[PDB]
Design a protein around this ligand. Sequence first.
Ligand SMILES: *[C@@H]1O[C@H](CO)[C@@H](O[C@@H]2O[C@H](CO)[C@@H](O)[C@H](O)[C@H]2NC(C)=O)[C@H](O)[C@H]1NC(C)=O
Lengths: 185, 119, 120, 106, 107
Amino acid sequence: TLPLPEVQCFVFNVEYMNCTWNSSSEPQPTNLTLHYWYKNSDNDKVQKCSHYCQLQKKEIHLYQTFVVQLQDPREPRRQATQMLKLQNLVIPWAPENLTLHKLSESQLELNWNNRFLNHCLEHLVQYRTDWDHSWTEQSVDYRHKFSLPSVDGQKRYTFRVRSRFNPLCGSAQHWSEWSHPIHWG
Amino acid sequence: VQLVESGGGLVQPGGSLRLSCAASGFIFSSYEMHWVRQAPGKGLEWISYISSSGTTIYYADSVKGRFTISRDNAKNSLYLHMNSLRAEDTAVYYCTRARITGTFDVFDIWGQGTMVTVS
Amino acid sequence: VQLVESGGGVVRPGGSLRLSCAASGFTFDDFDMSWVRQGPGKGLEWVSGINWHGSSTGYADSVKGRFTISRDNAKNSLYLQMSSLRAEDTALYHCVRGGTIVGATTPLDYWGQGTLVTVS
Amino acid sequence: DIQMTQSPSSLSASVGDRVTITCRASQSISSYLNWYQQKPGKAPKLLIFAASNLQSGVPSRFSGSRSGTDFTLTISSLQPEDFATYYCQQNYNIPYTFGQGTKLEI
Amino acid sequence: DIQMTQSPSSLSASVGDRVTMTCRASRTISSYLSWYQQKSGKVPNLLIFGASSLQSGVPSRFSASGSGTDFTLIISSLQPEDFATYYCQQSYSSPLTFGGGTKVEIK
Ligand SMILES: *[C@@H]1O[C@H](CO)[C@@H](O[C@@H]2O[C@H](CO)[C@@H](O)[C@H](O)[C@H]2NC(C)=O)[C@H](O)[C@H]1NC(C)=O
């Protein structure tokens, strides 16, 4: 007949877990119940969220299996459920304190410290230039340093960086939110 | 209570064909789907799963970058079409569901399966 | 590639009115917006602008203390709500793709039409 | 990923025996394991789940023990209506891996 | 702030003439100044790119030079679709400002 409004869940920098589902599409808007359980660990239980959802770091286990489900009170028979690789859906905070420093007269290096995770993240940088129609991309390895080989004096560049939980400890595809745009003068 | 799958019979290397699996008797929009391939002599080998409606993930190597799968909730169908077949993929194909009893998810009601041959 | 705004009406001095414009066919986060006005007697004039992140809002000489631009990338729109107006604010308002306030990536501009607002 | 071998034990039985079929997983899966009885040319049946529990509608003769990652399926008082290959598989983590499957024979 | 005076506002020329026109800026800008064209009763459009280059979709007939303080524009082999206002504009230091206005006559 009708499908449930579904849900995407993203772990934010391994601080708390947030699942957001839009109840606007269905008639008679309702904030349905949410559940969760960790299959991987032995001696496990089915828990109720009751924090409308949100889960604290006390109940987040990575590198392992996690299952989410949504239940509506009117029709208990009908529900939803998904199987999630929690290391495939980590969306950390946008990196803070995007430090720029200038090693040589014609090349640049970029540094940024993520909030919690260091050794399991890949990065992307987009830089532009004066009058540029487009934006030039470049990927970075698990190390958090990117180098721009060619720069110009009078021209000015805009850098925005988003990290990604890939590939050493997962295969997350979605990118982080754009950080505060650090501007070169 | 019923999973009936149908698909093509014959194909040459590099060819293609259609595989479908019709479900009836339960709320198809809730559970998890699974596709499994049985070789003529090797045995069973699970190849792919579908997580309700959102995500789908295939096997590590056998079907890693050749087949793609999807489903339709309104029509109650689960289908994948095979591309770039080979001589070792001549097998039988199974469509089954996953049920969560407590904290456990177990395979329930397997499909009858269809034969695919290459020669 | 189009820019469409909403609004209309008249108010005596000291009133308020919201002007919201949205972009279609663009990558909103990639480039920033601006505002340009024209009174029938004179030529074009610039109002204000930001940097696609709501962090470097720009001012003008005369409209500095009234209101300054707001943006919502998630909703993909831009807002300018005037209040405590004056008789010399009767003009036609356009919101323009492009512009720049902070340094770097000064992308020029692409105009997007507008409508008229008047106050006594 | 987690390759899951199985002791062959392809030994003849009779009308009523007590035989152990053990399939040690390479990694220590806590309690997640299913026993599938695959008839020739048909689909599996999911004899036992949770490595200790029992599926509804299944005779009580089958029983899992789980003696320290050495999962075993025991059958007492064998009947002729039970002669087929058995595959034990783990649902602990994707990708799911089956086993070689013992060809239990009369 | 930054003030732009687009002068002269009144010009006298006919079809196929060679007269460049200038823009002036109160404060120095290196190469941040574009140009626009305003035929009566329609939205302006971009005519000169950042400093001296040209946007695509425009005939190569229009030309510009003198980047810096006094930008200049020049057009050759005038057509019946080129008499308008130019409105030199800068995007160097906020707030942005436009020019005065130049009007060209038809004979
Ligand atoms: C994380 O989860 C919390 C818990 O709901 C969210 O907080 C609220 O989100 C809803 C969504 O519209 C709104 O009531 C408010 O935006 C939030 N309430 C507040 C902040 O008091 C939160 O939006 C989720 N996401 C983030 C990034 O925190």
